[PDB]
Structure 1
Amino acid sequence: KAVVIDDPPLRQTPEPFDEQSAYNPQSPIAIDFGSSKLRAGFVNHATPTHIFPNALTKFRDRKLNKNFTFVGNDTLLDQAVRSQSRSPFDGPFVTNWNLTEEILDYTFHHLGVVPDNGIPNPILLTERLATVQSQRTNWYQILFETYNVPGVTFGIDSLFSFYNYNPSGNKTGLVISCGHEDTNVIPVVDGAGILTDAKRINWGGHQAVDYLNDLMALKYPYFPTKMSYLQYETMYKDYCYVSRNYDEDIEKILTLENLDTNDVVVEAPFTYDWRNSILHLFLRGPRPHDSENIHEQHQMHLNVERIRVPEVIFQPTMGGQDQAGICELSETILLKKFGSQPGKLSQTSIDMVNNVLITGGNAKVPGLKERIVKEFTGFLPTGTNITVNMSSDPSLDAWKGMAALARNEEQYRKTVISKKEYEEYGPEYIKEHKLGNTKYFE
Structure 2
Amino acid sequence: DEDETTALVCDNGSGLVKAGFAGDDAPRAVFPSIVGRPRHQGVMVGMGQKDSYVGDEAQSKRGILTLKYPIEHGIITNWDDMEKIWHHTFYNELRVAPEEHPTLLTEAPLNPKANREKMTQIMFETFNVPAMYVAIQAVLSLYASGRTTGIVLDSGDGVTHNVPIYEGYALPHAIMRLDLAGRDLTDYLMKILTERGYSFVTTAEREIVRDIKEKLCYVALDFENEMATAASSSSLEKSYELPDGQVITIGNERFRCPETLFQPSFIGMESAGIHETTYNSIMKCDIDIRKDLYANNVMSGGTTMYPGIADRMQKEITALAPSTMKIKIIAPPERKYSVWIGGSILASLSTFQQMWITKQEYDEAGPSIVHRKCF
Instruction: Tell whether the structures are fold-level matches, with TM greater than 0.5.
Output: yes
- Figure out how many residues of one structure are paired with residues of the other and give that number: 369
Find the partner of 2:288 among 347, 352, 376: 347
Structure 1 segment 2-151 matched on structure 2, within 5 A: 22-57=1-36, 62-63=45-46, 67=50, 70-80=53-63, 83-110=65-92, 111-113=94-96, 119-151=99-131
Kept in 1, the 8 Å contact 2:188–2:266? The answer is no
Structure 1 segment 188-267 matched on structure 2, within 5 A: 188-220=165-197, 228-255=205-232, 259-266=233-240
Give the CA deviation at 1:229. Answer: 1.7
Find the partner of 2:260 among 290, 312, 335: 312
- Structure 1 residues 131 and 79: CA distance shift in structure 2, 3 A: closer
Give the CA deviation at 1:396. Answer: 2.9
2:330 aligns with 389
Give the CA deviation at 1:122. Answer: 0.8
Runs of 4+ off more than 6 Å: none
Q: Distance in 2 between matches of 1:194 and 1:159?
A: 12
1:329 aligns with 277
Letter in 1 for 2:118: N
Query: Could you list the per-position Cα deviations for residues 200-238 of structure 1 after superposition, in whole angstroms to 9, with x for gaps in the alignment?
Result: 222221111110001121343889x99822221222123
Kept in 1, the 8 Å contact 2:221–2:312? The answer is yes
Find the partner of 2:285 among 334, 338, 346: 338
TM-score, structure 2 as length reference: 0.86
Q: Distance in 1 between matches of 2:272 and 2:159?
A: 14
Give the CA deviation at 1:426. Answer: 4.2
Give the CA deviation at 1:74. Answer: 3.3
Give ranges in structure 2 of 5+ residues lacking alignment: none
Q: Distance in 2 between matches of 1:430 and 1:69?
A: 31
TM-score, structure 1 as length reference: 0.74
1:179 aligns with 156
- Structure 1 residues 104 and 252: CA distance shift in structure 2, 3 A: closer
Kept in 1, the 8 Å contact 2:154–2:336? The answer is no
Q: Distance in 1 between matches of 2:359 and 2:31?
A: 29
Give the CA deviation at 1:152. Answer: 1.0
1:278 aligns with none
Matched, 1:362 2:344: no
User: Larger % of helix: which?
Assistant: 2
Find the partner of 1:376 among 306, 309, 317: 317
Give ranges in structure 1 of 5+ residues lacking alignment: 1-21, 272-297, 340-345
Query: Could you list the per-position Cα deviations for residues 286-326 of structure 1 after superposition, in whole angstroms to 9, with x for gaps in the alignment?
Result: xxxxxxxxxxxx76342133232111111212221112322
Q: Distance in 2 between matches of 1:414 and 1:230?
A: 42
1:404 aligns with 345
Letter in 2 for 1:381: P
Letter in 2 for 1:185: N
Q: Distance in 2 between matches of 1:142 and 1:321?
A: 34
Give the CA deviation at 1:363. Answer: 1.0
Give the CA deviation at 1:357. Answer: 1.2
- Structure 1 residues 370 and 145: CA distance shift in structure 2, 3 A: same
2:134 aligns with 154
Q: Distance in 2 between matches of 1:137 and 1:226?
A: 31
Kept in 2, the 8 Å contact 1:183–1:202? The answer is yes
Equivalent position SS for 2:252 = coil
Kept in 2, the 8 Å contact 1:364–1:393? The answer is no
Q: Distance in 2 between matches of 1:398 and 1:134?
A: 21
Kept in 2, the 8 Å contact 1:417–1:431? The answer is no
Give the CA deviation at 1:65. Answer: 7.0
Kept in 1, the 8 Å contact 2:11–2:106? The answer is yes
Give the CA deviation at 1:132. Answer: 2.2
The Cα RMSD (Å) is 3.1
User: Larger % of strand: which?
Assistant: 2
